[PDB]
Design an enzyme around this catalytic site. Structure first.
Site, PDB file in Angstrom:
ATOM      1  N   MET A   1      21.239  47.249 -33.750  1.00 18.70           N
ATOM      2  CA  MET A   1      22.261  46.705 -34.628  1.00 18.70           C
ATOM      3  C   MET A   1      21.709  45.570 -35.447  1.00 18.70           C
ATOM      4  O   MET A   1      21.962  45.539 -36.667  1.00 18.70           O
ATOM      5  CB  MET A   1      23.505  46.255 -33.895  1.00 18.70           C
ATOM      6  CG  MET A   1      24.450  47.406 -33.503  1.00 18.70           C
ATOM      7  SD  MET A   1      26.075  46.847 -32.917  1.00 18.70           S
ATOM      8  CE  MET A   1      25.644  46.333 -31.249  1.00 18.70           C
TER       9      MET A   1
ATOM     10  N   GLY B   1      20.206  54.587 -40.110  1.00 13.81           N
ATOM     11  CA  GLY B   1      19.201  54.730 -39.064  1.00 13.81           C
ATOM     12  C   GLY B   1      18.251  55.908 -39.174  1.00 13.81           C
ATOM     13  O   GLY B   1      17.312  56.012 -38.352  1.00 13.81           O
TER      14      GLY B   1
ATOM     15  N   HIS C   1      19.440  56.323 -29.643  1.00 11.66           N
ATOM     16  CA  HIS C   1      18.779  55.400 -30.544  1.00 11.66           C
ATOM     17  C   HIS C   1      17.943  56.123 -31.580  1.00 11.66           C
ATOM     18  O   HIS C   1      16.922  55.587 -32.024  1.00 11.66           O
ATOM     19  CB  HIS C   1      17.885  54.396 -29.816  1.00 11.66           C
ATOM     20  CG  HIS C   1      18.604  53.388 -28.945  1.00 11.66           C
ATOM     21  ND1 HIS C   1      17.989  52.228 -28.502  1.00 11.66           N
ATOM     22  CD2 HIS C   1      19.803  53.440 -28.306  1.00 11.66           C
ATOM     23  CE1 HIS C   1      18.785  51.609 -27.638  1.00 11.66           C
ATOM     24  NE2 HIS C   1      19.900  52.314 -27.503  1.00 11.66           N
TER      25      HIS C   1
HETATM   26  C1  LIG Z   1      26.498  55.445 -27.024  1.00 12.36           C
HETATM   27  C2  LIG Z   1      25.788  54.530 -27.947  1.00 12.36           C
HETATM   28  C3  LIG Z   1      25.505  53.241 -27.527  1.00 12.36           C
HETATM   29  C4  LIG Z   1      24.839  52.296 -28.341  1.00 12.36           C
HETATM   30  N1  LIG Z   1      24.617  51.041 -27.894  1.00 12.36           N
HETATM   31  C5  LIG Z   1      24.088  50.066 -28.690  1.00 12.36           C
HETATM   32  C6  LIG Z   1      23.957  48.658 -28.257  1.00 12.36           C
HETATM   33  O1  LIG Z   1      24.316  48.273 -27.123  1.00 12.36           O
HETATM   34  N2  LIG Z   1      23.309  47.817 -29.079  1.00 12.36           N
HETATM   35  C7  LIG Z   1      22.919  48.151 -30.345  1.00 12.36           C
HETATM   36  O2  LIG Z   1      22.388  47.324 -31.118  1.00 12.36           O
HETATM   37  N3  LIG Z   1      23.087  49.458 -30.784  1.00 12.36           N
HETATM   38  C8  LIG Z   1      23.638  50.407 -30.036  1.00 12.36           C
HETATM   39  N4  LIG Z   1      23.828  51.691 -30.539  1.00 12.36           N
HETATM   40  C9  LIG Z   1      23.311  52.012 -31.841  1.00 12.36           C
HETATM   41  C10 LIG Z   1      24.105  51.713 -33.030  1.00 12.36           C
HETATM   42  O3  LIG Z   1      25.447  51.847 -32.616  1.00 12.36           O
HETATM   43  C11 LIG Z   1      23.758  52.733 -34.121  1.00 12.36           C
HETATM   44  O4  LIG Z   1      22.355  52.772 -34.221  1.00 12.36           O
HETATM   45  C12 LIG Z   1      24.358  52.352 -35.449  1.00 12.36           C
HETATM   46  O5  LIG Z   1      25.816  52.294 -35.371  1.00 12.36           O
HETATM   47  C13 LIG Z   1      23.821  53.359 -36.487  1.00 12.36           C
HETATM   48  O6  LIG Z   1      24.201  52.949 -37.794  1.00 12.36           O
HETATM   49  P1  LIG Z   1      24.302  53.996 -38.967  1.00 12.36           P
HETATM   50  O7  LIG Z   1      25.073  53.346 -40.119  1.00 12.36           O
HETATM   51  O8  LIG Z   1      22.902  54.588 -38.999  1.00 12.36           O
HETATM   52  O9  LIG Z   1      25.160  55.296 -38.422  1.00 12.36           O
HETATM   53  P2  LIG Z   1      26.638  55.317 -37.694  1.00 12.36           P
HETATM   54  O10 LIG Z   1      27.062  53.932 -37.337  1.00 12.36           O
HETATM   55  O11 LIG Z   1      26.443  56.419 -36.648  1.00 12.36           O
HETATM   56  O12 LIG Z   1      27.531  55.796 -38.895  1.00 12.36           O
HETATM   57  C14 LIG Z   1      27.404  57.127 -39.423  1.00 12.36           C
HETATM   58  C15 LIG Z   1      28.821  57.458 -39.857  1.00 12.36           C
HETATM   59  O13 LIG Z   1      28.930  58.678 -40.614  1.00 12.36           O
HETATM   60  C16 LIG Z   1      30.055  59.465 -40.256  1.00 12.36           C
HETATM   61  N5  LIG Z   1      29.681  60.816 -40.635  1.00 12.36           N
HETATM   62  C17 LIG Z   1      28.886  61.710 -39.925  1.00 12.36           C
HETATM   63  N6  LIG Z   1      28.692  62.828 -40.638  1.00 12.36           N
HETATM   64  C18 LIG Z   1      29.339  62.626 -41.830  1.00 12.36           C
HETATM   65  C19 LIG Z   1      29.482  63.361 -43.085  1.00 12.36           C
HETATM   66  N7  LIG Z   1      28.927  64.571 -43.246  1.00 12.36           N
HETATM   67  N8  LIG Z   1      30.257  62.817 -44.042  1.00 12.36           N
HETATM   68  C20 LIG Z   1      30.837  61.632 -43.922  1.00 12.36           C
HETATM   69  N9  LIG Z   1      30.711  60.871 -42.855  1.00 12.36           N
HETATM   70  C21 LIG Z   1      29.979  61.334 -41.832  1.00 12.36           C
HETATM   71  C22 LIG Z   1      30.160  59.144 -38.761  1.00 12.36           C
HETATM   72  O14 LIG Z   1      31.444  59.615 -38.366  1.00 12.36           O
HETATM   73  C23 LIG Z   1      29.801  57.652 -38.680  1.00 12.36           C
HETATM   74  O15 LIG Z   1      31.027  56.909 -38.873  1.00 12.36           O
HETATM   75  C24 LIG Z   1      24.429  52.704 -29.709  1.00 12.36           C
HETATM   76  C25 LIG Z   1      24.717  54.018 -30.108  1.00 12.36           C
HETATM   77  C26 LIG Z   1      25.404  54.897 -29.306  1.00 12.36           C
HETATM   78  C27 LIG Z   1      25.714  56.263 -29.798  1.00 12.36           C
END
Ligand SMILES: Cc1cc2nc3c(=O)[nH]c(=O)nc-3n(C[C@H](O)[C@H](O)[C@H](O)COP(=O)(O)OP(=O)(O)OC[C@H]3O[C@@H](n4cnc5c(N)ncnc54)[C@H](O)[C@@H]3O)c2cc1C
Ligand SMILES: *[C@@H]1O[C@H](CO)[C@@H](O[C@@H]2O[C@H](CO)[C@@H](O[C@@H]3O[C@H](CO[C@H]4O[C@H](CO)[C@@H](O)[C@H](O)[C@@H]4O)[C@@H](O)[C@H](O)[C@@H]3O)[C@H](O)[C@H]2NC(C)=O)[C@H](O)[C@H]1NC(C)=O
Ligand SMILES: *[C@@H]1O[C@H](CO)[C@@H](O)[C@H](O)[C@H]1NC(C)=O
Ligand SMILES: *[C@@H]1O[C@H](CO)[C@@H](O)[C@H](O)[C@H]1NC(C)=O
Ligand SMILES: *[C@@H]1O[C@H](CO)[C@@H](O)[C@H](O)[C@H]1NC(C)=O
Length: 581
Positions: free
Chosen positions: A559, A547, A514
């Site tokens: 989420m 995040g 998280h």
């Molecule tokens: C195991 C696990 C369980 C979880 N369980 C829950 C739950 O039950 N409930 C809930 O609400 N939330 C949960 N979360 C949290 C939620 O999934 C994340 O907080 C959320 O998806 C983060 O959003 P984001 O857009 O910050 O990053 P992400 O969704 O992590 O997206 C970042 C993206 O960037 C890509 N990327 C990385 N580096 C690069 C780069 N250099 N260039 C281009 N692309 C890149 C990645 O491949 C990814 O697709 C969980 C997370 C994990 C890991």
């Protein structure tokens, strides 16, 4: 289909210009891409390291296969430094593919306590980031389904006034088609014995007690990953382009006039085979909390004391990568009787006093007297740069705890043949960092250090919470099903006290995945990296939108917050587009 639409050859974009470049096609990235491209004149290129995964099969689409995907090409599996708490490396699961961590997460859909989000405005000076404003966006993103009779009898309760029904992200009760386990109601009864509420709708503003909850899945139980929800409906938009299989390495800066302007990105998979693509309007960083800060650093936006020894020119000096806030998770698991059979999850959102029990007074004494020492210590460990501003965050937490009685820990129950709690202290005082260790983005050499258990109250809290999950597993109605503890089991005496738990916990935990705060949305003078429109300080046409940006933890799954913040930021973006037509 969508597969045939996705770009994989760098030559398809190299040297071109689009309006917006979004680094990372995860939760925020795809939501934002979808919102922006609603105007057919707005061109967006999403650059994602991974690929499309949403139709892979149950390993992605069935939430009850959670964890099977770990270690695969769909898990970045980011390694931490050697942690000081236990001298071991930890793995941070993080989704690699369209939808990002929504591809691999547990699907739990809950919201923070109102006072937490309100404090983003009132304490962290983010104008308009109060509960009511953000909740409007959250409601808009949401497409929830009310529970049926059976799901209610299992323990669900759904307040129609706290859920949108006409949005984009499909959400509703997890239902594998089994009967529901009586263990969920048993946990409710056990905590009701101690005066703890039950069935409060965790999406309404007061997440406290033991409740069931919606999950991010369609009625047919397919995972509502962000790609399925925001890309799959929209990929035929000619103004929406998605390049897969490539990493954004750094932001290109043109240094005209008084301020640097983000004019594009460099992307690739290895040094010496990179390409540039350019943005007419803005670059938007959405690569996740572990990654977007490193992208800034590789670009010359970061702390001089980090960048200069690596041979990077510090173009804009900001405390990028500090304020990292992740939680620690530990497990208590018991066998159950056959009468415990059935499906179901629930969670106890436990207050500070529920967590600590008879240690409450002592824990409150630490909270009342040690804040300044703790902030000093965290700053000396490189988790944060300004002691005064950290003390404010800590006084904020102590306000949450003492004046609002927010949930301090979460005891997350799985059933389906066992009674298993994953347990975490929601409000760590520790602060960590992530920093690059080399200048080549494509080497992916970085120090991600959450500094788990380096604040004493985090270790005390975690220990008390995990002890409480053992306690509650054999209390009251839970004793109907309890058939012997299997974790810790023989690894920790069943009558272990709190000190004995503080000795066990550093060797039996995992990251909670998280992580927030690495490009914190708060004023620059408080240690912030972005303003209340997510613009990076001292750079034009650059936002970090993912995040990395929440300045605090929340007593919630994230989420709901992240879909809301994506849409809110998207409006700000579109306002600037409309202003400079
Ligand atoms: C195991 C696990 C369980 C979880 N369980 C829950 C739950 O039950 N409930 C809930 O609400 N939330 C949960 N979360 C949290 C939620 O999934 C994340 O907080 C959320 O998806 C983060 O959003 P984001 O857009 O910050 O990053 P992400 O969704 O992590 O997206 C970042 C993206 O960037 C890509 N990327 C990385 N580096 C690069 C780069 N250099 N260039 C281009 N692309 C890149 C990645 O491949 C990814 O697709 C969980 C997370 C994990 C890991
Ligand atoms: C992770 O591994 C670390 C080693 O890589 C462990 O750190 C070492 O822990 C040992 C104890 O197990 C300490 O040894 C003690 O040292 C003190 C005196 O320390 C001072 O003097 C030295 C001399 O130059 C200096 O390096 C120190 O910083 C102190 O100023 C003795 O009085 C003790 O009796 C005992 O020998 C190490 O000092 C310490 N640090 C190292 C080796 O760099 C660490 O505990 C491990 N962590 C976990 C959770 O296991
Ligand atoms: C349902 O939500 C409404 C609006 O937020 C709130 O007024 C009410 O107290 C809620 N009731 C319950 C039992 O959650
Ligand atoms: C929590 O516990 C302390 C005693 O340790 C007591 O002073 C306080 O009123 C309790 N707080 C709540 C919100 O019940
Ligand atoms: C440190 O933080 C405090 C509190 O936000 C602030 O008043 C001060 O300006 C900050 N220090 C610097 C050097 O900006």
């Amino acid at each position: 289909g969508i597969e045939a639409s996705l770009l994989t050859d760098p030559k398809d974009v190299s040297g071109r210009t689009v309006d917006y470049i979004i680094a990372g096609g995860g939760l925020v990235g795809l939501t934002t891409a979808a919102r922006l491209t609603e105007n057919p004149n707005i061109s967006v290129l999403v650059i994602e390291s991974g690929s499309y995964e949403s139709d892979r099969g149950p390993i992605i689409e069935d939430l009850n296969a959670y964890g099977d995907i770990f270690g695969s090409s769909v898990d970045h599996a980011y390694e931490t430094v050697e942690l000081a708490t236990n001298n071991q490396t930890a793995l941070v699961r993080s989704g690699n593919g369209l939808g990002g961590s929504t591809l691999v997460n547990g699907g739990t859909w809950t919201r923070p306590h109102k006072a937490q989000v309100d404090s983003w405005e009132t304490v962290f000076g983010n104008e308009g980031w109060n509960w009511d404003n953000v909740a409007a966006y959250s409601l808009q993103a949401e497409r929830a389904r009310a529970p049926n009779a059976k799901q209610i009898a299992a323990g669900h309760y759904f307040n129609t006034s706290c859920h949108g029904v006409n949005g984009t992200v499909h959400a509703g009760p997890r239902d594998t088609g089994d009967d529901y386990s009586p263990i969920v109601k048993a946990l409710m009864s056990a905590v009701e014995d101690r005066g703890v509420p039950t069935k409060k709708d965790f999406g309404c503003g007061d997440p406290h007690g033991v409740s069931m909850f919606p999950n991010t899945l369609h009625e047919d139980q397919v995972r509502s990953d962000a790609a399925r929800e925001w890309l799959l409906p929209n990929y035929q938009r000619p103004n929406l382009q998605v390049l897969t299989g490539q990493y954004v390495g750094k932001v290109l800066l043109s240094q005209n006039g008084t301020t640097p302007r983000a004019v594009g990105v460099e992307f690739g998979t290895h040094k010496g085979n990179t390409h540039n693509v350019y943005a007419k309007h803005e670059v938007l960083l959405a690569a996740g909390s572990a990654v977007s800060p490193t992208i800034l650093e590789y670009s010359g936006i970061g702390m001089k004391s980090i960048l200069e020894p690596l041979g990077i020119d510090t173009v804009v000096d900001l405390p990028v990568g500090l304020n990292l806030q992740d939680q620690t998770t530990a497990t208590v698991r018991s066998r159950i009787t056959s009468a415990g059979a059935g499906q179901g999850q629930a969670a106890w959102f436990a207050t500070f006093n529920e967590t600590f029990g008879d240690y409450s007074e002592k824990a409150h004494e630490l909270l009342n007297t040690k804040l300044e020492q703790w902030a000093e210590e965290a700053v000396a460990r490189g988790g944060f740069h300004n002691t005064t501003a950290l003390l404010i965050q800590y006084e904020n937490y102590r306000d949450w705890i003492v004046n609002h009685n927010v949930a301090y820990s979460e005891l997350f129950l799985d059933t389906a043949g066992v009674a298993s709690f994953d347990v975490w202290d929601l409000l760590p005082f520790t602060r960590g960092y992530v920093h690059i260790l080399d200048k080549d983005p494509y080497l992916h050499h970085f120090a991600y250090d959450p500094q788990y258990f380096l604040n004493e109250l985090d270790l005390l809290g975690q220990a008390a919470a995990t002890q409480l999950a053992r306690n509650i597993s054999n209390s009251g109605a839970m004793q109907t099903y309890f058939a012997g503890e299997t974790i810790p089991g023989d690894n920790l005496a069943y009558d272990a006290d709190l000190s004995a738990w503080t000795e066990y916990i550093p060797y039996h935990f995992r990251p909670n995945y998280h992580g927030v705060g690495t490009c914190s949305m708060m004023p620059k003078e408080m240690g912030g990296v972005v303003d209340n429109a997510a613009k990076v300080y001292g750079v034009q046409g650059l936002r970090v939108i993912d995040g990395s940006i929440p300045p605090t933890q929340v007593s919630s799954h994230v989420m709901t917050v992240f879909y809301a913040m994506a849409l809110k930021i998207s409006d700000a973006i579109l306002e600037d587009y409309a202003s400079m037509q």
